[PDB]
């Protein structure tokens, strides 16, 4: 809820692009995070193992988004 | 406080994609080996 | 298709032809049937008139006093039913006059109905009682066409002439009716054709060569008079609108 | 002449070229035999 | 006669008989009666102006408009009395069935 | 309620017939039937077709 | 041109120097604003009629439009005229679609993003669903079928010039693994700029957006492919199926896969038919004249479950031998001949030296084989004898016999069908 | 008239011969002439097998079921020990595969004390 209002205020200031909404989406911590995975493997178990590893990495990102959001 | 473009792009890439030994580019001992990463 | 009938639509390449089962519609380019209007007896139909302004609708006049209008675009679906109290119809013409109320500084007559929120109807289906936005009974064939970028409100005038007596009846907006009594009832001259000059200006041509002119011009040029015509129609509708919900 | 087969009524299509300022209209003559 | 089956129907029929009735009085009659009043008032103004603007010898009497004005005004006062009245009915309605249950 | 609404509806038809029709008819002019073709053809009975 | 004609006079009128740079700049800014306004007014005829001749000024228009109001005005006007003119049911549906895709490519070139295309598509699709024959003609246009198959079961005329034009527009195409990870992953973030996307540059996806579900599209694609495979694949359809397969897999409901699974099976069915026939000819010395197709019944939607007509004895014996070998090669499987399905190339040799080669169905070949005279005797057969010999109902036989009469092979005299052996008219 | 036949393009439909709304796999519920959810092409890519209990399954459906520890090597429809019917040419190519899985599951049941 706060992210929607804050993005509107930022657009009121300068806007002229969709940069601010995207960076909030990258940096927000209370919403599901969009992830990119390589997974240069074909076996299902290996793909699941890599996806879980990346989920743990994204969990680290969510934890440390405090410095950015402040 | 400028909202630069290319700077945002570089910090974006460093933000995304874990890289490291995993992906592409004795139990406590394994726990410590992971914990370092 | 060989027939002495058929009137071509001025705005689209479509004609209205007459066949035994009813009024029929065939595209000019393809000769392909488009719509069928079920009519019982041809002799009852005094005449049929197309829509000059838009061409999406079509008008049918009955001798007994009923006017029925069907849209071509909906596969000939009936869209509205009209009645005129105790009138024998000889030949009727349908005209649509678009009003242009350009903003003028000297006009301080602001509108507040637009400001007040629009009403809603109450309609109950079998499952539960539902509530829908309010639409006027004749608004479906009068609503602002999705087609018309110039969505200016269009005055709807139906002009009716009575046989055997040359009485002139003018019908506005589908609800209000005005009767005009002609002085020249000495001769029972059949009315040959109706010609429209511009919006609200008509010339009537009888068999004896006499020409009768009906002019809507003074009414169209008076902004208040048209508003008077619109107001009296609304008041009658809303009274029945409450009465419909009371029952 | 526009004729519907050899056993139906014949109706006249009088394409009267009334040159009114270079333009002309069209007429159709119905058949109602006297 | 009553049983459990009709009791729930009795409550369901009664609640819609009052709570839906007040809705149609407030959401329909009041906005409509105000709109009737605004239109007849505009109806009266137009006729009065042309009685002076034309200065035509024959005049159309305005008692027909005035009767409609008071009658429509009488309605709006009369509908508001019912809406308050159905308000009291709902209170009496609910207290009856909570004991009848 | 039914009596009051019908009282207004019946009275509403009276205002339309008594006053509105009187005003609309005054602003509506119907030109008297006239013969135009007599000037060109004064010694012929005229029959009009379309 | 305007400056050379009036600027010196205007400068004299004002009295300002001829080299007033900022006045000329403002005059130019007004000229392009007037150019924009005129183009917005005329955008309908610009995109519908003059395209692609007016393509160049569309690209120039792209250089000018900068505000969202400009885009919302350009679309709301363009819808208004298009719906005014094209969305008339009195307009032929084939030309309506031809003009429609002409606007789609015109606006796609004008707008690379395609958001305006999405707005147009959302606004227009119900009118497409209003018209009935749109699905059949568009998919037939997608697959580029010959006009003969169009005219067999479609009862309204279709403009061949409109057909050829839309095929040309449809075929218009003007619109290690560790090394890519360093390059591409980094490169995608080297250059970056800020209801789902639904704005893909593919026009064929926009065409698919007509259907509420692509299920009917793939089902009819299945039906047409089965009809062609039974008739005989052209390379043109391999591109079509490739475009279909590429888009659905990217998106990934249950029945969508149901009509997406076995499309590869009839491809496998024909591929296995091509391979198995070669094996059968090598082992048992089969007649190399017969090319059987082994199809799997469930996926051709062919309802095996009035057609008990007798094939010629020689052909039936040869076809039965194929079934026996198939049971030997694939244990546990039985093979059933689809007698209503199949094409036979027959050569008819007349006594006057005429040779007629025609592709006929198994039913038509059975009828004409009854008139094969080994002893050169003229065979005259009545309808009742043909029905008994071939076990075919008389009404169906009359249609089959009418086909041969139309081809000039059989002549009907006094209720008996005889062969035309001598034609007294130049072939 | 002489009719000479130059080329014949005949169409044949193949179906499974089952030694007799019930031509469906007891496990996946798909048609015998259809494919199981794990296979894409019919026939050789998704063959049928017949057990001694006369229950018919896709080869992958019953093999996966028998590979579950809860099956105990029993038929899903009759709970008898699943053995392929001998003498059916449809089962000949799958005899060794199913004997191994049933034997392996029997040995595991012996090891688990049940
Ligand atoms: Zn199965
Ligand atoms: Zn399988
Ligand atoms: Zn069993």
Q: What DSSP string describes G19-78?
A: T-HHHHHHHHHHHHHHHHHHHHHHHHHHHHTSTTTTHHHHHHHHHH--SHHHHHHHHHHH
For the CA atoms of G51, G57, G62, G65, the dihedral, rounded to the nearest 10 degrees, stands at -110
Distances (CA, A) of B36 to A37, B30, C226, G285, H11: 22, 10, 86, 72, 67
Neighbours of chain G (3+ CB pairs under 8 A): A, B, C, H
Q: Is C51 exposed, middle or buried (0-12, 13-18, 19+ CB in 10 A)?
A: buried
CB contact under 8 A, A40 and G194: no
Q: Which residues contact G346 (CB under 8 A, 6 or more apart)?
A: G357, G358, G360, G365, G368, H3, H4, H5, H6
CB contact under 8 A, G90 and C13: yes
Whether the CB of D27 is below 8 Å from some CB of chain C: the reply is no
- Dist. CA G4–CA G297, nearest whole Å: 79
Q: Which residues in C have their CB inside 8 Å of a CB on E? A: 112-113, 116-117, 119-120, 122, 129, 224, 227-228, 231-232, 234-235, 238-239, 241-242, 245
Q: Which residues in G have their CB inside 8 Å of a CB on B? A: 177-178, 181-182, 185-186, 189-192
Do D and H make contact via 3 or more CB pairs under 8 A? The reply is no
Q: Which residues pair with D3 in a beta bridge?
A: D10
CB contact under 8 A, B24 and G189: no
Residues H32/H49, Cβ–Cβ less than 8 Å? no
Question: Which DSSP letter does residue G345 get?
Answer: E
- Dist. CA G418–CA G395, nearest whole Å: 19
Q: What is the 3-state composition of chain H as percent helix, strand, coil, each rounded to the nearest 5?
A: 25, 25, 50
Report which of G65, G105, G100 is spatially closest to residue G86, judged by C-alpha positions.
G100
Strands G293-296, H2-16: pairing is parallel
Q: Which residues contact G283 (CB under 8 A, 6 or more apart)?
A: G325
Distances (CA, A) of C243 to E33, F2, G333: 12, 7, 76
The 10 Å CB-count burial string (b at 16+, else e) for H18-46 is: beeeeeebbbbebbbbbbbeebebbbeeb
Where would I find the beta strands (DSSP E) of C134-175? 154-162, 167-172
C194: nearest CA in chain F?
Answer: F50
> Would you state the structure tokens that stand for residue G402, as one six-digit string?
């009418």
- Dist. CA G100–CA G127, nearest whole Å: 12
Residues G120/G103, Cβ–Cβ less than 8 Å? yes
For the CA atoms of H24, H26, H29, H33, the dihedral, rounded to the nearest 10 degrees, stands at -30
How far separated are the first and last CA of chain D, in Å rounded? 20
Structure method: cryo-EM
Is-cis flag, bond preceding A32, omega within 30?
Answer: no
| Beta-carbon contacts below 8 Å between C and E | 48
Residue for token pair 């080297």: G190
- Dist. CA F5–CA E72, nearest whole Å: 9
Q: What's the sign of the alpha-carbon dihedral G389, G394, G396, G401?
A: positive
Residues A54/A62, Cβ–Cβ less than 8 Å? no
- Dist. CA H66–CA H87, nearest whole Å: 22
Q: What's the sign of the alpha-carbon dihedral G300, G306, G308, G311?
A: negative
Maximum Cα–Cα distance for chain A, whole Å?
Answer: 49
Q: Which of G289, G334, G357 lies at the smallest CB-CB distance from H8?
A: G289
Residues C97/C154, Cβ–Cβ less than 8 Å? yes
Do E and H make contact via 3 or more CB pairs under 8 A? The reply is no
Distances (CA, A) of E14 to A1, C125, E27, G36: 41, 19, 20, 65
For residue C24, the SS3 value is strand
Report which of G87, D8, A59, F16 is spatially closest to residue C148, judged by C-alpha positions.
G87
- Dist. CA C188–CA C166, nearest whole Å: 7
CB contact under 8 A, G83 and C14: no
Whether the CB of C31 is below 8 Å from some CB of chain G: the reply is no
- Dist. CA G40–CA G58, nearest whole Å: 11
> Would you state the structure tokens that stand for residue C22, as one six-digit string?
């009813």
Report which of C35, C39, C37, C32 is spatially closest to residue C73, judged by C-alpha positions.
C35
Residues G74/G61, Cβ–Cβ less than 8 Å? no
Q: Which residues contact G190 (CB under 8 A, 6 or more apart)?
A: B9
For residue C121, the SS3 value is strand
Do C and B make contact via 3 or more CB pairs under 8 A? The reply is no
Q: At what angle do helices A2-13 and A19-27 cross, to 10 degrees?
A: 150
Q: Which residues contact H5 (CB under 8 A, 6 or more apart)?
A: G289, G315, G344, G345, G346, G347, G365
Neighbours of chain D (3+ CB pairs under 8 A): C
Q: What is the 3-state composition of chain A as percent helix, strand, coil, each rounded to the nearest 5?
A: 65, 0, 35
Q: What's the sign of the alpha-carbon dihedral G225, G226, G227, G232?
A: positive
Q: Which residues pair with G411 in a beta bridge?
A: G418
- Dist. CA E37–CA G247, nearest whole Å: 62
- Dist. CA G105–CA G117, nearest whole Å: 9
- Dist. CA F15–CA E64, nearest whole Å: 6
Report which of G111, G112, G117, G87 is spatially closest to residue G99, judged by C-alpha positions.
G87
Strands F29-34, C211-215: pairing is antiparallel
How far separated are the first and last CA of chain G, in Å rounded? 69
Enclosing H/E stretch for C132: strand C129-133
Residues C48/C57, Cβ–Cβ less than 8 Å? no
Other Cβ atoms within 10 Å of C5 Cβ, number: 16
Q: Which residues contact C83 (CB under 8 A, 6 or more apart)?
A: C65, C66, C67
> Would you state the structure tokens that stand for residue G18, as one six-digit string?
């001829």
Maximum Cα–Cα distance for chain C, whole Å?
Answer: 64
- Dist. CA H24–CA H77, nearest whole Å: 13
Question: Which DSSP letter does residue D29 get?
Answer: B
């Amino acid at each position: 809820d706060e992210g929607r209002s804050l993005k509107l205020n930022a657009g009121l200031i300068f806007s002229e692009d969709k940069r601010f909404t995207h960076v909030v989406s990258l940096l927000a911590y209370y919403r599901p995070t969009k992830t990119q995975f390589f997974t240069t493997k074909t076996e299902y178990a290996q793909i699941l193992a890599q996806k879980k590893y990346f989920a743990k990495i994204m969990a680290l990102r969510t934890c440390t988004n405090g410095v950015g959001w402040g | 406080a400028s909202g630069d473009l290319e700077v945002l792009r570089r910090v974006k890439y460093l933000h995304e994609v874990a890289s490291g030994p995993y992906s592409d580019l004795s139990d406590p001992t394994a726990y410590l080996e992971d914990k370092k990463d | 298709i060989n027939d002495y009938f058929i009137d071509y639509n001025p705005l689209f390449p479509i004609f209205a032809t007459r066949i035994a089962k009813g009024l029929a519609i065939y595209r000019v380019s393809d000769h392909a049937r488009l719509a069928v209007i079920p009519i019982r007896n041809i002799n009852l139909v005094a005449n049929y008139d197309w829509d000059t302004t838009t061409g999406k609708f079509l008008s049918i006049f009955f001798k007994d006093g009923t006017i029925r209008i069907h849209d071509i675009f909906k596969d000939g679906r009936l869209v509205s039913f009209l009645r005129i109290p105790s009138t024998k119809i000889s030949k009727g013409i349908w005209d649509r006059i678009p009003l242009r109320y350009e903003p003028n500084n000297r006009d301080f007559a602001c509108n507040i109905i637009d400001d007040l929120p629009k009403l809603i109807r109450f309609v109950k289906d079998s499952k539960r009682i539902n509530i829908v936005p309010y639409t006027q009974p004749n608004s479906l064939w009068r609503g602002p066409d999705e087609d018309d970028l110039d969505s200016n409100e269009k005055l709807d005038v139906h002009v009716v002439f009575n046989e055997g007596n040359d009485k002139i009846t003018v019908f506005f907006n589908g609800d209000y009716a005005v009767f005009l009594s002609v002085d020249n009832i000495e001769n029972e001259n059949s009315l040959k054709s109706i010609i429209k000059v511009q919006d609200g200006f008509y010339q009537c041509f009888y068999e004896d060569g006499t020409v009768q002119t009906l002019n809507l011009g003074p009414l169209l040029q008076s902004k208040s008079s048209v508003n008077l015509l619109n107001y009296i129609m609304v008041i009658k509708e809303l009274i029945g609108y409450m009465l419909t919900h009371l029952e | 002449y526009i004729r519907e087969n050899r056993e139906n009524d014949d109706f006249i299509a009088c394409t009267a070229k009334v040159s009114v300022d270079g333009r002309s209209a069209s007429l159709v003559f119905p058949k109602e035999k006297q | 006669s009553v049983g459990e089956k009709n009791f729930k129907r009795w409550k369901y029929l009664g609640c819609e008989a009052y709570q839906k009735t007040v809705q149609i009085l407030t959401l329909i009659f009041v906005p409509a009666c105000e709109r009737i009043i605004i239109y007849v008032e505009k109806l009266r103004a137009i006729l009065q102006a042309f009685s002076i603007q034309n200065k035509l010898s024959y005049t159309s009497d305005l008692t027909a408009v005035e009767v409609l004005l008071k009658s429509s005004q009488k309605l709006l006062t009369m509908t508001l009395n019912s809406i308050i009245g159905l308000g009291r009915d709902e209170t009496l309605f609910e207290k009856f069935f909570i004991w009848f249950n | 309620y039914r009596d009051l609404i019908n009282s207004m509806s019946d009275m509403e038809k009276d205002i339309a017939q008594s006053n509105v029709n009187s005003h609309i008819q005054q602003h509506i002019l119907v030109d008297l039937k006239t013969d135009v073709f007599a000037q060109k053809y004064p010694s012929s009975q005229i029959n009009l077709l379309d | 041109k305007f400056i050379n004609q009036y600027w010196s006079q205007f400068s004299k009128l004002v009295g300002c120097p001829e080299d007033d740079h900022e006045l000329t700049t403002t005059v130019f800014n007004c000229f392009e604003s007037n150019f924009l306004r005129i183009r917005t007014n005329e955008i309908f005829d610009i995109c519908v009629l003059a395209y692609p001749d007016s393509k160049v000024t569309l690209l120039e228009l792209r250089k000018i439009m900068k505000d969202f109001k400009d885009y919302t005005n350009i679309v709301t006007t363009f819808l208004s005229d298009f719906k005014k003119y094209i969305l008339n049911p009195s307009v032929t549906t084939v030309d309506a679609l031809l003009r429609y895709v002409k606007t789609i490519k015109a606006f796609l070139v004008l707008d690379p993003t395609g958001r305006c295309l999405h707005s147009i598509t959302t606004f227009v699709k119900p009118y497409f669903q209003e018209r009935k024959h749109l699905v059949n003609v568009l998919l037939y246009a997608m697959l580029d079928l010959p006009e003969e198959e169009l005219k067999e079961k479609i009862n309204f005329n279709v403009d061949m010039k409109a057909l050829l034009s839309l095929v040309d527009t449809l075929h218009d195409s003007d619109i290690i693994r560790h090394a890519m990870l360093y390059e591409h992953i980094l490169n995608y973030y080297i250059a970056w700029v800020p209801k789902s996307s639904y704005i893909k540059t593919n026009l064929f996806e926009v065409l698919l957006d007509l259907f509420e579900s692509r299920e009917f599209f793939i089902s009819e694609f299945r039906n047409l492919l089965t009809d062609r495979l039974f008739t005989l694949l052209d390379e043109k359809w391999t591109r079509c199926l490739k475009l279909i397969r590429e888009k659905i897999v990217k998106f990934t409901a249950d029945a969508d896969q149901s009509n997406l699974n076995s499309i590869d099976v009839m491809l496998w069915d024909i591929k296995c038919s091509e391979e198995l026939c070669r094996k059968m000819h090598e082992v048992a010395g089969l007649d190399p004249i017969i090319f059987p197709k082994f199809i799997s019944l469930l996926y051709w939607k062919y309802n095996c479950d009035d057609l008990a007509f007798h094939l010629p004895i020689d052909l039936e014996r040869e076809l039965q031998k194929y079934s026996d070998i198939y049971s030997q090669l694939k244990p546990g499987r039985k093979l059933q001949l689809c007698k209503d399905k199949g094409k036979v190339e027959i050569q008819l040799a007349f006594k006057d030296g005429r040779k007629l080669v025609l592709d006929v169905s198994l039913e038509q070949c059975s009828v004409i084989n009854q008139f094969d005279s080994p002893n050169d005797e003229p065979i005259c057969l009545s309808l009742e004898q043909l029905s008994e010999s071939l076990n075919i109902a008389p009404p169906r036989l009359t249609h089959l016999l009418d086909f041969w009469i139309q081809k000039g092979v059989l002549l009907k005299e006094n209720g008996t069908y005889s062969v035309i052996e001598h034609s007294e008219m130049d072939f | 008239m002489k009719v000479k036949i130059n080329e014949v393009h005949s169409v044949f439909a193949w179906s499974w011969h089952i030694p007799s709304d019930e031509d469906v796999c007891g496990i996946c519920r798909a048609s015998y002439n259809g494919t199981c959810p794990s296979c894409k092409f019919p026939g050789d890519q998704c063959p049928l097998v017949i057990g001694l209990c006369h229950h018919n399954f896709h080869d992958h459906c019953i093999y996966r079921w028998l590979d579950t520890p809860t099956s105990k090597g029993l038929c899903p429809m009759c709970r008898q020990t699943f053995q392929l019917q001998k003498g059916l040419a449809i089962n000949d190519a799958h005899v060794q595969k199913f004997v191994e899985i049933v034997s392996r599951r029997r040995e595991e049941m012996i090891e688990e004390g049940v």
